[PDB]
PDB file of C-alpha atoms and ligand atoms in Angstrom:
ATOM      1  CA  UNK A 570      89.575 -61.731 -20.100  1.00 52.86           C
ATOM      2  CA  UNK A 571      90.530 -60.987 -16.470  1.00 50.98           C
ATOM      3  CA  UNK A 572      94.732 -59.857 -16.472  1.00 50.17           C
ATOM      4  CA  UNK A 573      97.360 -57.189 -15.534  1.00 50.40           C
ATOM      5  CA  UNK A 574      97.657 -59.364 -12.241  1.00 49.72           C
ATOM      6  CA  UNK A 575      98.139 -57.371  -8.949  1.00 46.28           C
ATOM      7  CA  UNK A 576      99.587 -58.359  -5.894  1.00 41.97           C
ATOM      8  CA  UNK A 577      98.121 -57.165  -2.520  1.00 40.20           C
ATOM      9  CA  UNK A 578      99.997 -56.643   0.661  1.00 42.48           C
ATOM     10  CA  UNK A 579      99.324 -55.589   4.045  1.00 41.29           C
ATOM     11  CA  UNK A 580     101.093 -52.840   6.644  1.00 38.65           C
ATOM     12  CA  UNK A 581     103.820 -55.490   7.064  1.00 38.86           C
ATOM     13  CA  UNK A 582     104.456 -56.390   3.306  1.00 37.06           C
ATOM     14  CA  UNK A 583     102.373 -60.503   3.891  1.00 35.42           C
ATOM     15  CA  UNK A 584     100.499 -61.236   0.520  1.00 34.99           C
ATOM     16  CA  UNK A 585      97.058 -61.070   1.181  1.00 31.35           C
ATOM     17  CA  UNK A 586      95.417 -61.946  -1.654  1.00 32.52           C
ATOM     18  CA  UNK A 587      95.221 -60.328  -4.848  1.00 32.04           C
ATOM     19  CA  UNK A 588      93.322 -58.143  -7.908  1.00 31.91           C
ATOM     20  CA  UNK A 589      93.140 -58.356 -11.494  1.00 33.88           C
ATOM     21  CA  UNK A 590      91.454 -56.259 -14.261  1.00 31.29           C
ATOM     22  CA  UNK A 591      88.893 -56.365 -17.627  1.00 35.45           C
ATOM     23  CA  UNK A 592      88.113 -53.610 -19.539  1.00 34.32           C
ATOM     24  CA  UNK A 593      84.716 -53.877 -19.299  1.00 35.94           C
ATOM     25  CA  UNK A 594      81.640 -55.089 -21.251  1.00 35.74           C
ATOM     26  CA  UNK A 595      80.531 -52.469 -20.470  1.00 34.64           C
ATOM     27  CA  UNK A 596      81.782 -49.717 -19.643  1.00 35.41           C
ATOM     28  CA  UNK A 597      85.257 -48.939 -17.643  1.00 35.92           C
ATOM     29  CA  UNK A 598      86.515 -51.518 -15.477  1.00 35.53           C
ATOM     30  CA  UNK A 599      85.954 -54.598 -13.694  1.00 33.34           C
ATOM     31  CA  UNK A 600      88.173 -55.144 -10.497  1.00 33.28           C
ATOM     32  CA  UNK A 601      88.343 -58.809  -9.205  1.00 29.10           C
ATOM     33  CA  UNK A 602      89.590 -58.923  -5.503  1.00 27.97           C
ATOM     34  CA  UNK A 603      90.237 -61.675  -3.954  1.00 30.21           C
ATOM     35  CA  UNK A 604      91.700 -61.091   0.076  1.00 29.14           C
ATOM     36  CA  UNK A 605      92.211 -62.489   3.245  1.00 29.39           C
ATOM     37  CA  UNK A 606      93.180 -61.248   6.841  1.00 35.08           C
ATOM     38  CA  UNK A 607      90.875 -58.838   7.095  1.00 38.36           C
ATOM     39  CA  UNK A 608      88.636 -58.101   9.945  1.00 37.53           C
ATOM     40  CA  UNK A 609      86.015 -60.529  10.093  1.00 37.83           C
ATOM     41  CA  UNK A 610      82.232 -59.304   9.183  1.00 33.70           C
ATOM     42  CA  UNK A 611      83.314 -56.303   8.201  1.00 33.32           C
ATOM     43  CA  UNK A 612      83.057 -53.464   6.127  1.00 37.97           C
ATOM     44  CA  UNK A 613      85.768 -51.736   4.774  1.00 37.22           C
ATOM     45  CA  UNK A 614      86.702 -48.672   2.583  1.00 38.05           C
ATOM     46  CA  UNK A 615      88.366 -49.619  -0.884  1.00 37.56           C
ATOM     47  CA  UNK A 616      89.558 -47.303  -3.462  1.00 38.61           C
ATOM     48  CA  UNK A 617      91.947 -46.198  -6.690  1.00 37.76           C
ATOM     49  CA  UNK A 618      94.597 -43.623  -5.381  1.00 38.94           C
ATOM     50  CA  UNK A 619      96.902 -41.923  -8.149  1.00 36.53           C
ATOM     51  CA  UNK A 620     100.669 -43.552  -7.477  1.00 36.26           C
ATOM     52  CA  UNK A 621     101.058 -47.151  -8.389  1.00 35.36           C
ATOM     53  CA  UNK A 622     103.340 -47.262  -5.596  1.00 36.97           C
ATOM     54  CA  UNK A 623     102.669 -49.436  -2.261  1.00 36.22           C
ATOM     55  CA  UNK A 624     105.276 -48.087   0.680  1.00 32.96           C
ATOM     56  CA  UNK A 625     105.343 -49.684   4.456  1.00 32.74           C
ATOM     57  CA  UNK A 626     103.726 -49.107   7.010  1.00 31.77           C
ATOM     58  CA  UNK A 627     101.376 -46.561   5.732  1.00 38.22           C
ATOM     59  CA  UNK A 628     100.840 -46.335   2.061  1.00 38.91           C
ATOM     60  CA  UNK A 629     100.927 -42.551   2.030  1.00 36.91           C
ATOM     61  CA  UNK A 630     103.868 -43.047  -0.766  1.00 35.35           C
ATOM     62  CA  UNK A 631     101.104 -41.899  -2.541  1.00 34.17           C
ATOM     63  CA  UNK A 632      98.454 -40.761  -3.552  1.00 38.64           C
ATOM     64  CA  UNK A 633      95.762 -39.183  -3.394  1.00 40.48           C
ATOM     65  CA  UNK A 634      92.355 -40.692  -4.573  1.00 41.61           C
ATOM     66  CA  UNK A 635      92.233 -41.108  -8.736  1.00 39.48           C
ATOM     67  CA  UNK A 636      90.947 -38.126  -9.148  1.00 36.01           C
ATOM     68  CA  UNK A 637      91.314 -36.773 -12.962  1.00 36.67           C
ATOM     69  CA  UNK A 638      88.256 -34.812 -12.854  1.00 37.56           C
ATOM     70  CA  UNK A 639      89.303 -32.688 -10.127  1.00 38.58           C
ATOM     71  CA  UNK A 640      85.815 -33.401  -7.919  1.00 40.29           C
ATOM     72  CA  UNK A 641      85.618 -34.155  -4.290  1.00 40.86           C
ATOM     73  CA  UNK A 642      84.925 -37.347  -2.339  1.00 39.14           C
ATOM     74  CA  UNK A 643      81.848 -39.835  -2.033  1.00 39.53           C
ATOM     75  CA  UNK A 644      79.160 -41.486  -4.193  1.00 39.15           C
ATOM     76  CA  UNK A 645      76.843 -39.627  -1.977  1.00 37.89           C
ATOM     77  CA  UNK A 646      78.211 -36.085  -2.096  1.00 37.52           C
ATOM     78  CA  UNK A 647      76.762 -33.476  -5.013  1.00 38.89           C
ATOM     79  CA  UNK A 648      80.687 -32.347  -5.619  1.00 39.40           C
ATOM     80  CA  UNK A 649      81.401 -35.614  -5.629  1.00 37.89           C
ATOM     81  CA  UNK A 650      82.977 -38.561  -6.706  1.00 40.10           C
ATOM     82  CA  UNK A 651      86.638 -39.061  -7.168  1.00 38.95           C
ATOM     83  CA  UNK A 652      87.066 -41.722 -10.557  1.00 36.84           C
ATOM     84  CA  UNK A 653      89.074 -44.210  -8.204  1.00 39.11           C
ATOM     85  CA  UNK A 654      86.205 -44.156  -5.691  1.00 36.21           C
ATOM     86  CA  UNK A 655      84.491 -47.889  -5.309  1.00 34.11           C
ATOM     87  CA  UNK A 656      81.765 -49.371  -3.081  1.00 37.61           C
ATOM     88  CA  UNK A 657      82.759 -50.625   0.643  1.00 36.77           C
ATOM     89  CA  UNK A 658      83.989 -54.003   0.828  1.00 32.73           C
ATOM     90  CA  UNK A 659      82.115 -57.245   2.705  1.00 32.86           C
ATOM     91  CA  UNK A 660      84.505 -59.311   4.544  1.00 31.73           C
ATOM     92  CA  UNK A 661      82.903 -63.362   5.768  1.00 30.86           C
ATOM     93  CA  UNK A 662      82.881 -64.862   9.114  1.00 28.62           C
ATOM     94  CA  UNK A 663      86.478 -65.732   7.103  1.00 29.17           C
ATOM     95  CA  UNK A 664      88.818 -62.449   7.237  1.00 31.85           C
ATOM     96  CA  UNK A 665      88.184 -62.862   3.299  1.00 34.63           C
ATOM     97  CA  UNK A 666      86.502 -61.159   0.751  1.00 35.44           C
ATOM     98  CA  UNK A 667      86.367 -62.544  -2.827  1.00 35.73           C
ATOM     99  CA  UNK A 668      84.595 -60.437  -5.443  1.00 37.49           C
ATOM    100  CA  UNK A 669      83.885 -58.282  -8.717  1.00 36.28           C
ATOM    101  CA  UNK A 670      83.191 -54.480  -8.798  1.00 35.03           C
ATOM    102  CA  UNK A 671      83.028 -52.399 -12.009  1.00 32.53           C
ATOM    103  CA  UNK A 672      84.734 -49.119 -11.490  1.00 35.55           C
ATOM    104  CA  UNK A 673      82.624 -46.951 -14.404  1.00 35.24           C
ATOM    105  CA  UNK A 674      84.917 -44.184 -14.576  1.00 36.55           C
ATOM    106  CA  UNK A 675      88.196 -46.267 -15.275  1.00 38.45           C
ATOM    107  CA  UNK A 676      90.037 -46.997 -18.492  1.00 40.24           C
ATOM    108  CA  UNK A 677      93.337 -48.367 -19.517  1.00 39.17           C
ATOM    109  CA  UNK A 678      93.066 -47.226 -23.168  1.00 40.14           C
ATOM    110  CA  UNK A 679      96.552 -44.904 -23.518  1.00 40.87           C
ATOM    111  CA  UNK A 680      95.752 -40.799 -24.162  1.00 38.84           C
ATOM    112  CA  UNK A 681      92.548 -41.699 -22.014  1.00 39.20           C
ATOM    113  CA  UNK A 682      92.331 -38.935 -19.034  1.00 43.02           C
ATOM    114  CA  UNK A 683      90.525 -41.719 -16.909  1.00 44.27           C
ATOM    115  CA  UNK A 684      93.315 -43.860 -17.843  1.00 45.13           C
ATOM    116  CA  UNK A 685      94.436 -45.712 -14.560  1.00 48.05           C
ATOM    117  CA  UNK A 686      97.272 -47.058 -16.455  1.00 50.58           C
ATOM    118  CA  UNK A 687      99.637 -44.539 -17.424  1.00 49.15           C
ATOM    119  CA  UNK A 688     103.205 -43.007 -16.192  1.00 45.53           C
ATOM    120  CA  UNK A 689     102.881 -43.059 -12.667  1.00 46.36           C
ATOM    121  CA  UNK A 690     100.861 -46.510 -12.543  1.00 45.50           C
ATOM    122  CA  UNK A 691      97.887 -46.594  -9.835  1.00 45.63           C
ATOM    123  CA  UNK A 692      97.277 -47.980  -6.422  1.00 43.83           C
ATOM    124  CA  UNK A 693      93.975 -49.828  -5.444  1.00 41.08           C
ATOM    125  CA  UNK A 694      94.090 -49.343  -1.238  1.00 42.16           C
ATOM    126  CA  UNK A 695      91.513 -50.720   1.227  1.00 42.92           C
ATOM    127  CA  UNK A 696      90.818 -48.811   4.619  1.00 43.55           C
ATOM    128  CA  UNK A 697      90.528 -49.651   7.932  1.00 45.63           C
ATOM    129  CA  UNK A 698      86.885 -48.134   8.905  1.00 45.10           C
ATOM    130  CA  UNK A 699      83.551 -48.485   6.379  1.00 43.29           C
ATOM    131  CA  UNK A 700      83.465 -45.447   4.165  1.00 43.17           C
ATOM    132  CA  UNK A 701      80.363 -42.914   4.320  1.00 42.54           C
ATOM    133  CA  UNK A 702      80.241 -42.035   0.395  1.00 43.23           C
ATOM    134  CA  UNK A 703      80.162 -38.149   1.600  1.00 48.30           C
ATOM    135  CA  UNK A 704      83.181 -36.985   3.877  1.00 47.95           C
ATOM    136  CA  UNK A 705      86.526 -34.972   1.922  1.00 49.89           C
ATOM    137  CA  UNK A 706      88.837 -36.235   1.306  1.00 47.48           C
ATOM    138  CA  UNK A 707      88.382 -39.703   2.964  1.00 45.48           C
ATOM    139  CA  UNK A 708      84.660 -40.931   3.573  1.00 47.16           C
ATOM    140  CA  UNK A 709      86.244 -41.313   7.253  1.00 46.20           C
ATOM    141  CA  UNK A 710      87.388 -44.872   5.984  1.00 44.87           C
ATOM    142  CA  UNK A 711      90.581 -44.421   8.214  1.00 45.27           C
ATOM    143  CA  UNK A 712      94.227 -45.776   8.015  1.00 45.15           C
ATOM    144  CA  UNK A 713      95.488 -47.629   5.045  1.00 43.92           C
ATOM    145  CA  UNK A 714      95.839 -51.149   5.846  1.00 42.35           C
ATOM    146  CA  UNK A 715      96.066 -52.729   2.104  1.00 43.28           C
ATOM    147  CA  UNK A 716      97.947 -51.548  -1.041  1.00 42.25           C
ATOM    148  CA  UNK A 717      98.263 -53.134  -4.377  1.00 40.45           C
ATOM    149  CA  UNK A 718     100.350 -51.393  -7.186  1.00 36.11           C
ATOM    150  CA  UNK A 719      99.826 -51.074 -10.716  1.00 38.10           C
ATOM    151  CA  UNK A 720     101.699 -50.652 -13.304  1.00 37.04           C
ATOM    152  CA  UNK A 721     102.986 -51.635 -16.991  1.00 36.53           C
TER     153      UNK A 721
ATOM    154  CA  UNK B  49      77.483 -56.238  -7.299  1.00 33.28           C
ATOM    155  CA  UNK B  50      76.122 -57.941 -10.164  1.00 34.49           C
ATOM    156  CA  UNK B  51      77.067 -61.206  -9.799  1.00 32.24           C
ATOM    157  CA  UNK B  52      74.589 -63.064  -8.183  1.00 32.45           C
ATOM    158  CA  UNK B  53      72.810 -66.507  -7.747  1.00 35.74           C
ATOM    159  CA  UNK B  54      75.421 -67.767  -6.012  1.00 39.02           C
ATOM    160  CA  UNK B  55      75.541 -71.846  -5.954  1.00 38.65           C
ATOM    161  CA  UNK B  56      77.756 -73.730  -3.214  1.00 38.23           C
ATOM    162  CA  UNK B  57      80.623 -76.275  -4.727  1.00 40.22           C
ATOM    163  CA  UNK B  58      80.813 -79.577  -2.816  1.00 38.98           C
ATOM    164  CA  UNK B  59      83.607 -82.655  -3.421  1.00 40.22           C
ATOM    165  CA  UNK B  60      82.591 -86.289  -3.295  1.00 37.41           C
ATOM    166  CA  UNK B  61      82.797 -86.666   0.474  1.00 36.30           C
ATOM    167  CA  UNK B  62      80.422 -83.461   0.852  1.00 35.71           C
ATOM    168  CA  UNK B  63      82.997 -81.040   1.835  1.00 36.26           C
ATOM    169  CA  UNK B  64      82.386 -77.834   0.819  1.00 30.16           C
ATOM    170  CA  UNK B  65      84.776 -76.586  -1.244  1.00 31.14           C
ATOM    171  CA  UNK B  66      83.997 -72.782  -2.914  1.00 31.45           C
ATOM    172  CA  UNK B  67      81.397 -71.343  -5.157  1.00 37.98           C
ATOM    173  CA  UNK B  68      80.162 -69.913  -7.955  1.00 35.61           C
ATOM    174  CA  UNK B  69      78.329 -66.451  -9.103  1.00 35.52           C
ATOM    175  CA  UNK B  70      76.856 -65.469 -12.521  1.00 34.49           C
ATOM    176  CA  UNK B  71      76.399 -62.069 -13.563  1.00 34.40           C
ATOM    177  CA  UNK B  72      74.495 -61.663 -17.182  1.00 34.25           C
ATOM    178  CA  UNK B  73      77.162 -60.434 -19.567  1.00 33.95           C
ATOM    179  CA  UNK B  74      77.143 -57.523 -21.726  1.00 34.84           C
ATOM    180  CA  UNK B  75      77.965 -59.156 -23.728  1.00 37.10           C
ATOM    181  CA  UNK B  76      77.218 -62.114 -24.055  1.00 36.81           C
ATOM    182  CA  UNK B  77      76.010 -64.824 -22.209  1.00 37.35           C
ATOM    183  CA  UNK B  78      77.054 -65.068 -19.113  1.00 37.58           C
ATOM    184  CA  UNK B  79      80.119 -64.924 -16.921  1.00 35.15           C
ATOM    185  CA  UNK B  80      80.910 -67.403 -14.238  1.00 34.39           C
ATOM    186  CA  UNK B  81      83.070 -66.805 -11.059  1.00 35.86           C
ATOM    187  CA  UNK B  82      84.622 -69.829  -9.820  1.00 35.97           C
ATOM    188  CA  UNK B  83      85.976 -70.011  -6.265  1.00 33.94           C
ATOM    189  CA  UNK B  84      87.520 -73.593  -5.215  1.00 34.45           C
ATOM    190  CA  UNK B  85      89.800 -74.387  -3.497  1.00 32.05           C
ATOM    191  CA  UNK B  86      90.682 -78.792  -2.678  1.00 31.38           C
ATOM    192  CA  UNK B  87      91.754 -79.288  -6.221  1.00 28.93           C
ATOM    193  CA  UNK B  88      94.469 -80.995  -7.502  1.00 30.28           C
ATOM    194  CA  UNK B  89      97.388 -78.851  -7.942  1.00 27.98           C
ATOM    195  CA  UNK B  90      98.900 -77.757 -11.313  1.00 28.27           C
ATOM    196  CA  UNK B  91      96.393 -80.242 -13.178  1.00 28.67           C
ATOM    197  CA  UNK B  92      93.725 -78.715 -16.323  1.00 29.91           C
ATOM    198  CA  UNK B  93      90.144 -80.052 -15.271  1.00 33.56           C
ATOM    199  CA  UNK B  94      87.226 -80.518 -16.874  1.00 30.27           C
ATOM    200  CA  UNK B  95      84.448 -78.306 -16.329  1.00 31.24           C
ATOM    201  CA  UNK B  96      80.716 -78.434 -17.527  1.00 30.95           C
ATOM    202  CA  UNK B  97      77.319 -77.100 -17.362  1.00 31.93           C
ATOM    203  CA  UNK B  98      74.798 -80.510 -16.914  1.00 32.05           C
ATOM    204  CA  UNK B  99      71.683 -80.155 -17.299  1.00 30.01           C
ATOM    205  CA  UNK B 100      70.032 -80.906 -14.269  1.00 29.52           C
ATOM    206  CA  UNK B 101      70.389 -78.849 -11.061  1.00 31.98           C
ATOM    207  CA  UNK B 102      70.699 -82.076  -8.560  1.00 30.29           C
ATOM    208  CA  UNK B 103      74.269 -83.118  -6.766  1.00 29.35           C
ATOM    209  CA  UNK B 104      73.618 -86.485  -5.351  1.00 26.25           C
ATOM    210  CA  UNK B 105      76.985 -87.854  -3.644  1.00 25.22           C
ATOM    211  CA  UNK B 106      79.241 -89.398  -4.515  1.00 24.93           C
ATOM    212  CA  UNK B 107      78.907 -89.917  -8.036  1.00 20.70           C
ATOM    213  CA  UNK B 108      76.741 -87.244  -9.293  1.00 23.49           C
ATOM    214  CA  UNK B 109      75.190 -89.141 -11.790  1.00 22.92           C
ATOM    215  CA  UNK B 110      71.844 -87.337 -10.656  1.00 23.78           C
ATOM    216  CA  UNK B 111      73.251 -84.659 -12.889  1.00 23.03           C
ATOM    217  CA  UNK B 112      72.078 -86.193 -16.496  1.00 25.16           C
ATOM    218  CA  UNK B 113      74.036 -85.138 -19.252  1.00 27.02           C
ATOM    219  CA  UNK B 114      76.233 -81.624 -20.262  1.00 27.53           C
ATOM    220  CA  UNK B 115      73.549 -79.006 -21.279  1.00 27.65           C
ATOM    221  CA  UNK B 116      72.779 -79.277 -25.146  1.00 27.77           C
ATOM    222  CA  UNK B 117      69.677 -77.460 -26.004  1.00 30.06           C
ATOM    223  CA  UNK B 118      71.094 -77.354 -29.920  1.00 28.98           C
ATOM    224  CA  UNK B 119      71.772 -81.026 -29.959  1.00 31.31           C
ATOM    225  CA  UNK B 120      75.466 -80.647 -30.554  1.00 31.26           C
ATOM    226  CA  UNK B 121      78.055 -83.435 -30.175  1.00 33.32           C
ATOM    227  CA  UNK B 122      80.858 -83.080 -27.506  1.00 32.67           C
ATOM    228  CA  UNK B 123      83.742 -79.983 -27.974  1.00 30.97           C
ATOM    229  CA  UNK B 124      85.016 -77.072 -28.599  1.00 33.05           C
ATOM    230  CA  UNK B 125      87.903 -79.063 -31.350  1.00 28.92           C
ATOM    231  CA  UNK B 126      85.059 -81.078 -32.693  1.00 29.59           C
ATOM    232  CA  UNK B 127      83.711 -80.006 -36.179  1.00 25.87           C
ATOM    233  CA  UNK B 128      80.436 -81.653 -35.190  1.00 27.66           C
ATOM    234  CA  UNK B 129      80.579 -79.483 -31.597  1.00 30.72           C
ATOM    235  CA  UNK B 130      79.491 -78.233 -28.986  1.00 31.42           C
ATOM    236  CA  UNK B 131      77.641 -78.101 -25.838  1.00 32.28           C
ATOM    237  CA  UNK B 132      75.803 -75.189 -24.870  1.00 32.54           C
ATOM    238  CA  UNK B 133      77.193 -76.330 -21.683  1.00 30.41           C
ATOM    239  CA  UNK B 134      80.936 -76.533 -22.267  1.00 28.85           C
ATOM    240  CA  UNK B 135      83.281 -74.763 -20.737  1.00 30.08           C
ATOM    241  CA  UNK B 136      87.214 -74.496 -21.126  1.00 29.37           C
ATOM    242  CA  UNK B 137      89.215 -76.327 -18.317  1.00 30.85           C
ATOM    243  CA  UNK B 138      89.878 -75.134 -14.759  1.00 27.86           C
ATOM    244  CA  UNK B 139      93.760 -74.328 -14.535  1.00 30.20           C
ATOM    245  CA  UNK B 140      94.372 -75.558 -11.071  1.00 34.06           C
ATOM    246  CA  UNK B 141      97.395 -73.771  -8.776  1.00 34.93           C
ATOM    247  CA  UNK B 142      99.948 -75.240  -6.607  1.00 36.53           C
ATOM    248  CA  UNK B 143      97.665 -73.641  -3.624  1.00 34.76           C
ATOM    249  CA  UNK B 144      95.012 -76.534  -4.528  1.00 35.78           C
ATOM    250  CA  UNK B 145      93.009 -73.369  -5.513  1.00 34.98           C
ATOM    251  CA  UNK B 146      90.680 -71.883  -8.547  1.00 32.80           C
ATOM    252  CA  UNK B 147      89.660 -68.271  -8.756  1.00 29.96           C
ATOM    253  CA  UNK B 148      88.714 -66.692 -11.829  1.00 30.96           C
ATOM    254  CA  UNK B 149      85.569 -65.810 -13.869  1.00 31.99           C
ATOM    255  CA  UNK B 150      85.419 -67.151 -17.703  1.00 34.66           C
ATOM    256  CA  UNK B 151      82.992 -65.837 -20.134  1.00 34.44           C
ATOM    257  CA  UNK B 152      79.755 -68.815 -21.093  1.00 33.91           C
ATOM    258  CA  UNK B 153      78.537 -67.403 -24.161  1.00 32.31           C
ATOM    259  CA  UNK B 154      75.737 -70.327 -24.949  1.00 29.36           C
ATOM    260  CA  UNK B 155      73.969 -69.581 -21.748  1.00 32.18           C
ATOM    261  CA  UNK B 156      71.337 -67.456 -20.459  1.00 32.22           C
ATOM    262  CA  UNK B 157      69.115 -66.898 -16.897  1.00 30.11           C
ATOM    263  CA  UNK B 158      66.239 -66.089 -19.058  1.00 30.41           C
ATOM    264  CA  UNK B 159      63.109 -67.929 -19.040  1.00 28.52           C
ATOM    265  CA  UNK B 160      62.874 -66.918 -22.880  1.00 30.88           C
ATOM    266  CA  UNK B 161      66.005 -68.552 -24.053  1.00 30.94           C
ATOM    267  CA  UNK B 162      66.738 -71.631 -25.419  1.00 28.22           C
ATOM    268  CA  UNK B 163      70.019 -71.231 -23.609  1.00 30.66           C
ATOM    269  CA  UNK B 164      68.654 -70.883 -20.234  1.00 31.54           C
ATOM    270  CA  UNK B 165      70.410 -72.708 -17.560  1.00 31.27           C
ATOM    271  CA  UNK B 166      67.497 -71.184 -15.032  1.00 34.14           C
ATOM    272  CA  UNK B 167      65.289 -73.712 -16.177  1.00 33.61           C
ATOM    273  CA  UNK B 168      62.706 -75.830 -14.332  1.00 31.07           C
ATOM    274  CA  UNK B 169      65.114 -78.315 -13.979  1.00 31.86           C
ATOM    275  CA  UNK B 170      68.388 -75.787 -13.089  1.00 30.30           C
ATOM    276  CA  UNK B 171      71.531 -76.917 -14.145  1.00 28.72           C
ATOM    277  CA  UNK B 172      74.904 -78.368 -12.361  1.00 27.39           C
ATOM    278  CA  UNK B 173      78.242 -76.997 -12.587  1.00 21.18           C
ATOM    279  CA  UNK B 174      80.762 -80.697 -12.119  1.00 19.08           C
ATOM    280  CA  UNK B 175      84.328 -80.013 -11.959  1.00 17.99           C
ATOM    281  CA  UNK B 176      86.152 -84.067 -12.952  1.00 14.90           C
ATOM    282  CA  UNK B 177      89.125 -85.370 -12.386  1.00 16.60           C
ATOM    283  CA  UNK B 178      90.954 -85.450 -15.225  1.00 16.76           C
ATOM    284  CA  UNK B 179      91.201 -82.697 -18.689  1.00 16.91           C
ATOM    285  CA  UNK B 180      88.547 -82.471 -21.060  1.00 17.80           C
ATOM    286  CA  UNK B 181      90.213 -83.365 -24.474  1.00 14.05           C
ATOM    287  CA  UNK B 182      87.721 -80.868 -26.285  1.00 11.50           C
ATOM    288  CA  UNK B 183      87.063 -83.602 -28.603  1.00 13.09           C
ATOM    289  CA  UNK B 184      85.608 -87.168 -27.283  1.00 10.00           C
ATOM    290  CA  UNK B 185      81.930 -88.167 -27.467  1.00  8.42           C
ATOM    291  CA  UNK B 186      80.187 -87.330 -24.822  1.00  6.92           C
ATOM    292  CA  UNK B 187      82.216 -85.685 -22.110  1.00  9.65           C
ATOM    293  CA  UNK B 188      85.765 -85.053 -23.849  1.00  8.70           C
ATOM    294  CA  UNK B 189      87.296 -88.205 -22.094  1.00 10.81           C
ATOM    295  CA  UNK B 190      87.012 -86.078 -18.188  1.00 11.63           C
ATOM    296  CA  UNK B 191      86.402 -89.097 -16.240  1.00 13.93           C
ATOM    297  CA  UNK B 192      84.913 -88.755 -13.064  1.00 15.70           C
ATOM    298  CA  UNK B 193      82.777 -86.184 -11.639  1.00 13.64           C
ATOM    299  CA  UNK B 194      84.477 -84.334  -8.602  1.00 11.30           C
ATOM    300  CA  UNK B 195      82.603 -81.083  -7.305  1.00  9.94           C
ATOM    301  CA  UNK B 196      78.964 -80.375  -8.187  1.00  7.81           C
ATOM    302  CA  UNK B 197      77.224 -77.139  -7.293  1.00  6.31           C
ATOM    303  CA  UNK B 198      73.523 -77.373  -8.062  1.00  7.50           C
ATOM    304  CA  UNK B 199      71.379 -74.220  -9.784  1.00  9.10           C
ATOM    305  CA  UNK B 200      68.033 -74.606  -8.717  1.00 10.12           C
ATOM    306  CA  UNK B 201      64.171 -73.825  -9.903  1.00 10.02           C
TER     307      UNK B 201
HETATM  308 CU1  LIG C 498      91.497 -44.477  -0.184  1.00  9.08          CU
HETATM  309 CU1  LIG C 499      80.874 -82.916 -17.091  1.00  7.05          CU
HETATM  310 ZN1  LIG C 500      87.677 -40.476  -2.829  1.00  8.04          ZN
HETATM  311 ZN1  LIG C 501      80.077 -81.493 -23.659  1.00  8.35          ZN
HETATM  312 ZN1  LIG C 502      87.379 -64.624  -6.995  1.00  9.82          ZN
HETATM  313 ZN1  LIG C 503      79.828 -71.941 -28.034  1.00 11.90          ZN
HETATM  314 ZN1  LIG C 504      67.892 -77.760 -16.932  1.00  7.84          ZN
END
């Protein structure tokens, strides 16, 4: 079953929407997100950074991509692919997006390295441009606009 | 994504009102992501797989009966139960508002299976007004039907 309920918020600290998580059948994670206010027909960068920690205006406060393998940035890039990297996100005629993506390389099993629950918790963040699966550290997906931290 | 064939919800008076996706579960079955919104706040509701992908307003009676390719008798509390297409109730926030995926695991999209809701005939997902019981002969006591999206072909 879906759970460990996240709350999303934007660069002024509105609720936006929201995420929760299954460990998956199969295998990793599967990420519901479910958001509004967004700009409409988009598409928009969305990933897993490495501080469950969600800090106006700018999100900064941190990380950092989930990165426990130590690779670089982008489905597309040879180096690549950062754990807490995920596919852009659609937005409708709306401002709202409203789906499921399995992040593979996920886990929230304790003494697992891909762990995204652990000490420090984990933030899922979505960008302000489309990401290009290929450009470090960033996929030139921008500013980040949405945070969402978790912990437990 | 994964989830796919996605089937638009619509109330009584034809307003649309969310939708559904299925993605083919491993495993099993399938799993169902329900997006509604127009729904009675706070209340449990009723929620079925029928067996027959037509949504004829107001009523939806053009929907024929909860899916039961095993013959079962109505509910998941019922010794003698259940439908293939039962499912548990919708938990309905203060928002008016459903969002959540729940697991179907006597279903199928396969042409193969005896569970297959992708059938000739499709199926229809009804949301009704009041809480299936999980018990009473035929429909758990849900009363009326209130939002039908129709799976065709
Ligand atoms: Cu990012
Ligand atoms: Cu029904
Ligand atoms: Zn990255
Ligand atoms: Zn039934
Ligand atoms: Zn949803
Ligand atoms: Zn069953
Ligand atoms: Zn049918």
């Amino acid at each position: 079953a879906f759970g460990h309920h996240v709350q999303l918020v934007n660069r002024e600290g509105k609720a936006v929407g929201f995420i929760e998580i299954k460990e998956s059948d199969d295998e990793g994670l599967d990420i519901h997100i479910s958001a509004n206010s967004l700009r409409p027909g988009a598409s928009l960068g969305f990933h897993i950074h490495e501080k469950g920690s969600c800090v106006r205006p700018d999100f900064e406060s941190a990380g950092g991509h989930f990165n426990p393998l130590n690779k670089e940035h982008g489905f597309n890039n040879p180096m690549g692919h950062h754990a807490g990297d995920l596919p852009n996100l659609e937005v409708g005629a709306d401002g709202k997006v409203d789906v499921i993506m399995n992040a593979p390389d996920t886990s929230l099993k304790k003494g697992s390295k891909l762990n995204i629950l652990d000490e420090d918790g984990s933030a899922f963040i979505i960008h302000e441009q489309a990401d290009d699966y290929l450009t470090n550290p960033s996929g030139n997906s921008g500013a980040r606009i949405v945070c969402g931290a978790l912990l437990g």
